[PDB]
Amino acid sequence: RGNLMGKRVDFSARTVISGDPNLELDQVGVPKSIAKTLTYPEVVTPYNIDRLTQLV
Amino acid sequence: SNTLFDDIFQVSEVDPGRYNKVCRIEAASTTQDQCKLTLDINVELFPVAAQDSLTVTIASSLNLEDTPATRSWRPPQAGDRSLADDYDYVMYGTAYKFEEVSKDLIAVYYSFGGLLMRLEGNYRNLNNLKQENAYLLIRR
Amino acid sequence: MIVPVRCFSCGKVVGDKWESYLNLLQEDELDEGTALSRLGLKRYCCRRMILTHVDLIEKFLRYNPLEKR
Amino acid sequence: NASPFIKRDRMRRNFLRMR
Amino acid sequence: TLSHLRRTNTPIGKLAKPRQLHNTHWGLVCPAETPEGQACGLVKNL
Amino acid sequence: YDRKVPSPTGEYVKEPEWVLETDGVNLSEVMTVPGIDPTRIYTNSFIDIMEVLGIE
Amino acid sequence: SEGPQVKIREASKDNVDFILSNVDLAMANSLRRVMIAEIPTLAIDSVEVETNTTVLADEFIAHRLGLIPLQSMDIEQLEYSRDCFCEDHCDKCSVVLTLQAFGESESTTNVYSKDLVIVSNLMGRNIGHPIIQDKEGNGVLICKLRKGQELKLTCVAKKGIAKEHAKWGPAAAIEFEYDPWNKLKHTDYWYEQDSAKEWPQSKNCEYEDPPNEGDPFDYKAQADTFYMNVESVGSIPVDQVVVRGIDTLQKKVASILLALTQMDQD
Amino acid sequence: RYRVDLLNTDHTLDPSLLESGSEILGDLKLQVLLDEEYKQLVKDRKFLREVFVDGEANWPLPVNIRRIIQNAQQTFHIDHTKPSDLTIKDIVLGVKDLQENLLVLRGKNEII
Amino acid sequence: MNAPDRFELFLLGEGESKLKIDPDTKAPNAVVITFEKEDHTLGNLIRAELLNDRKVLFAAYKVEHPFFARFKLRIQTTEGYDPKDALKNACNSIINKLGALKTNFETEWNLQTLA
Amino acid sequence: SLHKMSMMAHRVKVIPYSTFRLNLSVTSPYNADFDGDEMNLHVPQSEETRAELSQLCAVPLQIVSPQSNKPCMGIVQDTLCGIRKLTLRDTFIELDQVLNMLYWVPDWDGVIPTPAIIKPKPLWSGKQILSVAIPNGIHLQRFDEGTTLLSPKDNGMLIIDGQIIFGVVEKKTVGSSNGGLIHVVTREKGPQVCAKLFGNIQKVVNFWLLHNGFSTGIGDTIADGPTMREITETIAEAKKKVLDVTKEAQANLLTAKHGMTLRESFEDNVVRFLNEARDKAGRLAEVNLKDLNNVKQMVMAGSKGSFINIAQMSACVGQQSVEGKRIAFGFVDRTLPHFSKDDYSPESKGFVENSYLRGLTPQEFFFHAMGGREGLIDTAVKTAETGYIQR
Amino acid sequence: ASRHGQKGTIGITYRREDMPFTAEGIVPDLIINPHAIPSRMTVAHLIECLLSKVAALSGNEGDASPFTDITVEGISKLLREHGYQSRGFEVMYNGHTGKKLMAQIFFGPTYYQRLRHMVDDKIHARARGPMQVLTRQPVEGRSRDGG
Amino acid sequence: NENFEDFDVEHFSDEETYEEKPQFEQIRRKTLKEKAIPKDQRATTPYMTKYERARILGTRALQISMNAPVFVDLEGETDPLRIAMKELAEKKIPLVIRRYLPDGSFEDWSVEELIVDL
Amino acid sequence: FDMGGYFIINGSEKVLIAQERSAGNIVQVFKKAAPSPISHVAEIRSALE
Amino acid sequence: FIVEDDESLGHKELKVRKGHIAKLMATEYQDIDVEEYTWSSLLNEGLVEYIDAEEEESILIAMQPEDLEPAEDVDPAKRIRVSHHATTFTHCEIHPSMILGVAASIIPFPDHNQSPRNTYQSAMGKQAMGVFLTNYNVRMDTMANILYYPQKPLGTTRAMEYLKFRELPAGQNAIVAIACYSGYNQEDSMIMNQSSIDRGLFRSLFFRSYMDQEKKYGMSITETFEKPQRTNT
Ligand SMILES: [Mg+2]
Ligand SMILES: [Zn+2]
Ligand SMILES: [Zn+2]
Known part of the structure; x- marks a missing residue:
């Protein structure tokens, strides 16, 4: 129950929450430092070679 | 374009309700004994009392010409001649019910943005009213 | 801990009025409201700035200094 | 109604006046 | 610090109801001062 | 109790009805006494319901 | 002149009280917001602490020093700090002040803002002076020193607006009121029995005719005749507050015009 | 609300409701279909009163028929003054074979 | 720590302009201008003065988020009238009225001698 | 996260502050309030899980x-x-x-x-x-x-x-x-x-x-003079009815309801009278409140508050109950040492007649503290027990 | 948090020119929501705000002891004596447009306490970090860059 | 450490309460082809479910993200998920779905023949 | 303003929380449950100092 | 307090009189030269008595002396006072507000709140931020939070004068509007004036102390506080 059936994970973030009437219903406001920390591995295609090169 | 309905009504009673800006008036036609009117009036722009004669006019449009809202409303330019110029109080709203009170008595329901108006009477003059948007034109 | 320089809401400079407020209190025998009205604090934001301020600075100066020259 | 203020300096001066 | 120096502690295995405020607690412990945790009513402040 | 009974006109009328409430569960011989409806007798304890009536 | 009209009711050293007539509501509110947040002003921005044996923290003293109102008459002649060619600060875009206070007295020594010494060359400008308002002659009480305590530090004062930080605000509180008789019905007075009784009349009610209580609601009436009271913090005189606010708003609209003409040729 | 008679007048249908409303009166096969529908409704009422002994009408059910009816009314601008285009045989057959399309189980054997 | 350093309320960032005029496809003769590094102070004033114009059908502004100092202002005018020209006329009118307000204020201040 | 709606998929909007910001309408399924709640974030690292998160766990789909x-x-x-x-x-x-x-x-x-x-x-x-x-x-x-x-x-x-x-x-x-x-x-x-x-x-x-x-303000909880007098009259006549039932029971003329003792029947009648008194006083206060009354607006909007909140803030807090009954005799035959022995009056056993606006007498304050303590204890045990049941 | 159990975080921060303001130019330091009041039935928050307003105007600190004979009506009379509305409402003006707010706003000082739950001590994120020695799972605690 | 009166429920925490109360075939067999139900007698729904559509979108977007040949015309779209939804829109996803019955048997439904109504 | 009332142990300010206990040498009578064969129990927690 | 029969006035009366109160204030003001009159002076004269919960079982206590003691038109704003209609009191409460603890004595008008809110505030006041001691500059405590400008509350309790709360407060008097301004304060959020934050509203210091120690694990297994170099560390 502590290490197998549920466990601690990476690529997670935790902070306090605030209301935002100007955000959409399905939209979340992520802090910039959290966004600078959490990453998503994106596979290089011709469709995103320029964008990924610019990000690099 | 033309006046779909027009009559002279005698305001029997003005009910303020719990609204301090809107009063629901009770009116009966003078010419026709079986036509009467209930209508909500924004009174700071058009103050009415009991026993007031009102020229109630329902038209499908305000321009003086015939009909050709699917067009965006715009502020009236200077010199624009409309049917509203001859009336002291103009509403705009939609029909939402045509229920028959009797064999001859048809009642028409109009909602001007939430200001409700029930007009009933015989159908030989109310037959002009259908399911469209109508302008309610009032002068005192 | 020491009197704030400016009122929190409006920003009127009240940090120069603290010692004059003390003078209006302790030897002129005025009540606090007349003392604030004397200093021109007519908005109650400035009035709660001077009235509610507690001066811990004298309680801190009672300690012997850590570096004495 | 009663005065809703903690004003204890003024009865301090008053009690010193009786003293 | 003042609140911490006047705390009590009730070590809870019996069948009584030691968590609810009792009538005899009048004027001896605070009627409304207790943690919201599992020590609610057990930790009382004089 | 006020049960809803189909009226002979077709409607459902709120017919009042004398209902006996009991504390302490016995069912096997309580359902066998005359003057009652043993087809409508209900018990708070579903365990005795399972033992006496059945699993369904 | 045709346009907005100004009639000052009360002019003081740090308070103008004027009636602003024949003007739209949005222009009055925008002018109010501009004198609240948009006027450039000199204020202490960076503090170089050399000796601090006080009982207060270093950045505590720095934050107190930032809020000291500095004289800002010739603030237009100064240049913006990032807009200058210099490395960190110079006399063209900054004013350097110093503060050397010692506890030589047995009693507690008060460090006032009048103890600030300007060490830069002003080139004849009228900026950098700490503002003295009280009759005592001192300034804002910066800190206190007992015997043997020393405070030596260097302040670099740059210019900025209150949007960047409220220490650059010369605004204090700006009173602002239109239609004291509620003739436009922009408010519905909460009441228990009589809204004319629980609500005290404002002092500006004397400058307008009370409603006739039988006349109809003038729906064509619009908001004008604004009652404004501007309070100067002390950095600039209050007339200069209003004038520089009009300057800043006019320059913002002119910058919009300039950007529009600049993209227009493209 | 439910019984329609094409051979009598106590439960007759007004000919103004539909264009095939005058000459439909006095038909036999359509009356047979209507009697079958009314018998089905009576059996349905008996079954429902057997199931819900409290006579509770409101129950959680999948498809909101009323909203679909109102959407069709407002989509096609039902003026309720023009006689309806529907023949009653088409209505009966449509209601009957709609139930065949309501497929929860796609098995092709008896018990399924 | 995540707070932006607060000159970004009124400093034009690198590689971006003061204005961004984008035509509006929803209505004929309508554009949306994104003002960058301003807020309600300019937006309300421009909106009201554009509403004072007679050949302007629509005029509205909105600050979509208080975090970012920007607002989108939408103008729809009558046919044959450029919304850019309406914006220029509104800005010119504001300049003229602010100048008149200025001159009135200094003259009527110089009338005051109790300062 | 008791249920599946309490953890869902959102779309990122990078914002320049230190908070997870989110729409107000989505706080109800999360059971979230901005009084310092932490709330977790998880980023999928693959296109498959990203896609099924967007197509299965998204906010609008649920x-x-x-x-x-x-x-x-x-x-x-x-x-x-x-x-x-x-x-x-x-x-x-x-x-x-x-x-x-x-x-x-x-x-x-x-x-x-x-x-x-x-x-x-x-x-x-x-x-x-x-x-x-x-x-x-x-x-x-x-x-x-x-x-x-x-x-x-x-x-x-x-x-x-x-x-x-x-x-x-x-x-x-x-x-x-x-x-x-x-x-x-x-x-x-x-x-x-x-x-x-x-x-x-x-x-x-x-x-x-x-x-x-x-x-909303302090004036929104204030009933006027005549309505306050009417509320006081309602409370006084309920106290009169309770006193009459007490005199009947002390002369033993009070019959016992079936299956239930004289003590429990008398207590049931007293609590029924006090509860209907509080409800009547609250109804009087609610009828008094204008349509411009802010709490009245909030109640008819249904956004916050209820009728009983208006009743307790403006008319009468009511009878304080501990474990379903009135305040028990913690002392010998009395609830507090400020009452005599064998006092069964409503004020002696936990009926708070004052509103929150007028403030509580210290006996009423202690009784209401006992009731609130019961509420807090019930919340604390119920949370753990229901989490146990849910797992 | 206030002194009445009305805790919460800062939603957003506005500058002075955006906040509402009285006819005297006073802006709030802080705006709470009306919805905190009726569900919690926290009347003493409002009474403390009223008494604090009267205290700031008069210069005498307010007596807010529980079981005194201090009524809201006396505080209302004292507030009306200072030229303000007796129930503490004020005519506010919108910060953005300068128009009068249609509903008057309850206004006044209220003693608030800063709590220690700073977001900077609680914000936490981890993409990849150290492992536990035994289970080879992410470690515990934001101080160790945990999972 | 820390001393917080702010009652934060430490979660997944019901074993305090566990310790409080601790006392109280014939059609298909093996791996034959009989598990593969023929297309003529498939008894599952022709409607592709929400989980089926989610996994097809995930698999197709994963393949497209690794240079699988896109079988629809791109409209300048670069995101693999929207390309996958475009492929699903005109049934150009070359996949079939193996719906396993509880007995171990299965039916094969192509994405082309599955009705996408949701 | 420091009031004392605590101990300094290894430089840590330690306070002894008052442990609350039932009194000794008092007779208390309790009613046990129905399945127990004993109806009432009179108990004293006899204590000497 | 002690209630005696007091046959001089013909009814029960507190043994404390205005003379004893005057002696008490004389001693208290001389502390700020007469005969010393302390709490023990009242204790030794039979004026006050120590009562525990057993002795509370056999006594009758009055709320207030001026209300319940003398033998018995009313203000509609006041709360309803019951006089209990009985005059056989043995004791009287010193003050009813003294039933509260330290934390609950900070709450202004706690009798006007729902009791769970008072409990929440009592728990929350320990998490308040402010000056905890005047010698915070010389204490190397592990964590220390000190407000910049603490202010005594405008609405203050008589009880907190004895808690020295007016000398070491834990908050500020903030001008508070109760408004649905922009939808950014909904449901336990606030909109705080950023200009006020710039001017020092609720700004506070935070001290953290790091303790490190060098120890000898034996003869040569020890460590030294030194600046390491990349060549040899
Ligand atoms: Mg929460
Ligand atoms: Zn101020
Ligand atoms: Zn330079």
Whole structure:
């Protein structure tokens, strides 16, 4: 129950929450430092070679 | 374009309700004994009392010409001649019910943005009213 | 801990009025409201700035200094 | 109604006046 | 610090109801001062 | 109790009805006494319901 | 002149009280917001602490020093700090002040803002002076020193607006009121029995005719005749507050015009 | 609300409701279909009163028929003054074979 | 720590302009201008003065988020009238009225001698 | 995270502060309040899990809860109060504000609706502007008590082709209720249109409430003189009835109800009298409160508070109960040492007659503290026990 | 948090020119929501705000002891004596447009306490970090960059 | 450490309460082809479910993200998920779905023949 | 303003929380449950100092 | 307090009189030269008595002396006072507000609140931020939070004068509007004036102390506080 059936994970973030009437219903406001920390591995295609090169 | 309905009504009673800006008036036609009117009036722009004669006019449009809202409303330019110029109080709203009170008595329901108006009477003059948007034109 | 320089809401400079407020209190025998009205604090934001301020600075100066020259 | 203020300096001066 | 120096502690295995405020607690412990945790009513402040 | 009974006109009328409430569960011989409806007798304890009536 | 009209009711050293007539509501509110947040002003921005044996923290003293109102008459002649060619600060875009206070007295020594010494060359400008308002002659009480305590530090004062930080605000509180008789019905007075009784009349009610209580609601009436009271913090005189606010708003609209003409040729 | 008679007048249908409303009166096969529908409704009422002994009408059910009816009314601008285009045989057959399309189980054997 | 350093309320960032005029496809003769590094102070004033114009059908502004100092202002005018020209006329009118307000204020201040 | 709606998939908007910011309407399924709640984030690292998170766990796809076949999200709090205030019949919006409200709707088609009042001044009603947020083809009809096609109370609802005909928009309309606007829109238009509706209504109502203002104050909990006297008379006559029952029971003339002792029957009668007294006093206070009363507006909006909150703040807190009965004799034959022995008067056993506005007597304060302590203990044990049951 | 159990976080921060303001130019330091009041039935928050307003105007600190004979009506009379509305409402003006707010706003000083739950001590994120020695799972605690 | 009166429920925490109360075939067999139900007698729904559509979108977007040949015309779209939804829109996803019955048997449904109504 | 009332142990300010206990040398009578064969129990927690 | 029969006035009366109170204030003001009159002076004269919960079982206590003691038109704003209609009191409460603890004595008008809110505030006041001791500059405590500008509350209790709360406060008097301003304060959020934050509203210091120690694990297994170099570390 502590290490197998549920466990601690990476690529997670935790902070306090605030209301935002100007955000959409399905939209979340992520802090910039959290966004600078959490990453998503994106596979290089011709469709995103320029964008990924610019990000690099 | 033309006046779909027009009559002279005698305001029997003005009910303020719990609204301090809107009063629901009770009116009966003078010419026709079986036509009467209930209508909500924004009174700071058009103050009415009991026993007031009102020229109630329902038209499908305000321009003086015939009909050709699917067009965006715009502020009236200077010199624009409309049917509203001859009336002291103009509403705009939609029909939402045509229920028959009797064999001859048809009642028409109009909602001007939430200001409700029930007009009933015989159908030989109310037959002009259908399911469209109508302008309610009032002068005192 | 020491009197704030400016009122929190409006920003009127009240940090120069603290010692004059003390003078209006302790030897002129005025009540606090007349003392604030004397200093021109007519908005109650400035009035709660001077009235509610507690001066811990004298309680801190009672300690012997850590570096004495 | 009663005065809703903690004003204890003024009865301090008053009690010193009786003293 | 003042609140911490006047705390009590009730070590809870019996069948009584030691968590609810009792009538005899009048004027001896605070009627409304207790943690919201599992020590609610057990930790009382004089 | 006020049960809803189909009226002979077709409607459902709120017919009042004398209902006996009991504390302490016995069912096997309580359902066998005359003057009652043993087809409508209900018990708070579903365990005795399972033992006496059945699993369904 | 045709346009907005100004009639000052009360002019003081740090308070103008004027009636602003024949003007739209949005222009009055925008002018109010501009004198609240948009006027450039000199204020202490960076503090170089050399000796601090006080009982207060270093950045505590720095934050107190930032809020000291500095004289800002010739603030237009100064240049913006990032807009200058210099490395960190110079006399063209900054004013350097110093503060050397010692506890030589047995009693507690008060460090006032009048103890600030300007060490830069002003080139004849009228900026950098700490503002003295009280009759005592001192300034804002910066800190206190007992015997043997020393405070030596260097302040670099740059210019900025209150949007960047409220220490650059010369605004204090700006009173602002239109239609004291509620003739436009922009408010519905909460009441228990009589809204004319629980609500005290404002002092500006004397400058307008009370409603006739039988006349109809003038729906064509619009908001004008604004009652404004501007309070100067002390950095600039209050007339200069209003004038520089009009300057800043006019320059913002002119910058919009300039950007529009600049993209227009493209 | 439910019984329609094409051979009598106590439960007759007004000919103004539909264009095939005058000459439909006095038909036999359509009356047979209507009697079958009314018998089905009576059996349905008996079954429902057997199931819900409290006579509770409101129950959680999948498809909101009323909203679909109102959407069709407002989509096609039902003026309720023009006689309806529907023949009653088409209505009966449509209601009957709609139930065949309501497929929860796609098995092709008896018990399924 | 995540707070932006607060000159970004009124400093034009690198590689971006003061204005961004984008035509509006929803209505004929309508554009949306994104003002960058301003807020309600300019937006309300421009909106009201554009509403004072007679050949302007629509005029509205909105600050979509208080975090970012920007607002989108939408103008729809009558046919044959450029919304850019309406914006220029509104800005010119504001300049003229602010100048008149200025001159009135200094003259009527110089009338005051109790300062 | 007791249920599946309490952890869902959102879309990132990078913001320059230190908080997870999120819509107000989504806080109800999370059971989240901004009093310092932490709330976790998880980022999928693969296209498969990203796709199934977007297509299975997304916020709009789970608007309607399978828990109780009704929407779990709705218009709440300030937006609910402002949408009630906006759709009143008194509310008319001028052109300058109307254009800003129209531009605040992102999917506004760019046509200005014709005003409800053309002359002598172009005025749009609040229902007229709110109907712009409602997409076309939506038909909702609801009749309350006393609701006809003419609505003197403006209760119920009627929406035709996404246009509000009458009725104030309330918790029964845009709240998390079955058959409301949210349920109808997400069943006829889809989840994306319902999420856009959430955003549009929130934006336009929040803007109008910003330029309208809404407050509450100490004066909103104050009943006037005659109503306060009427409340005092109700409490006094209930005390008279309780005293008469006490005198009957002390002469043993009080019969015992079936299966229940003289003590329990007497206590049942006393508690029944005190509860109906508190309800009657609260009803008197609620009838007193004007439509401009802020707490009254919030109660009829359903955004916060209830009838009993008005009753306790303004008329009478009521009888304090511990474990279902009145305040027991913790001392010998008395509740407090400030009462004599064998006192069964309502003030002696935990009936608080004063309102929160007038403040509590110290005996009433201690009794209410006992009741609140019971509530806190019940909450603390119930949370752990129900988590146990759920796992 | 206030002194009445009305805790919460800062939603957003506005500058002075955006906040509402009285006819005297006083802006709030802090705006709470009306919805915190009726569900919690926190009347003493409102009474403390009223008494604090009267105290700031008069200069005498307010007596807020529980079981005194201090009524809201006396505080209302004292507030009305200072030229303000007796129930503490004020005519506010919108910060953005300068228009009067249609509903008057309850206004006044209220003693608030800063709590120690700063977001900077609680914000936490981890993409990849150290492992536990035993289970080879992410470690515990934001101080160790945990999972 | 820390001393917080702010009652934060430490979660997944019911074993305090566990310790409080601790006392109280013939059609298909093996791996034959009989598990593969023929297309003529498939008894599952022709409607592709929400989980089926989610996994097809995930698999197709994963393949497209690794240079699988896109079988629809791109409209300048670069995101693999929207390309996958475009492929699903005109049934150009070359996948079939193996719906396993509880007995171990299965049916094969192509994405082309599955009705996408949701 | 420091009031004392605590111990300094290894430089840590330690406070002894008052442990609350039932009194000794007092007779208390309790009613046990029905399945127990004993109806009432009189108990004293006899204590000497 | 002690209630005696007091046959001089013909009814029960507190043994404390105005003379004893005057002696008490004389001693208290001389502390700020007469005969010393302390709490023990009242204790030794039979004026006050120590009562525990057993002795509370056999006594009758009055709320207030001026209300319940003398033998018995009313203000409609006041709360309803019951006089209990009985005059056989043995004791009187010193003050009813003294039934509260330290934390609950900070709450202004706690009798006007729902009791769980008072409990929440009592728990929350320990998490308040402010000056905890005047010698915080010389204490190397592990964590220390000190407000910049603490202010005594405008609405203050008589009880907190004895808690020295007016000398070491834990908050500020903030001008508070109760408004649905922009939808950013909904449901336990606030909108705080950023200009006020710039001017020092609720700004506070935070001290953290790091303790490190060098120890000898044996003869040569020890460590030294030194600046390491990349060549040899
Ligand atoms: Mg929470
Ligand atoms: Zn101020
Ligand atoms: Zn330079």
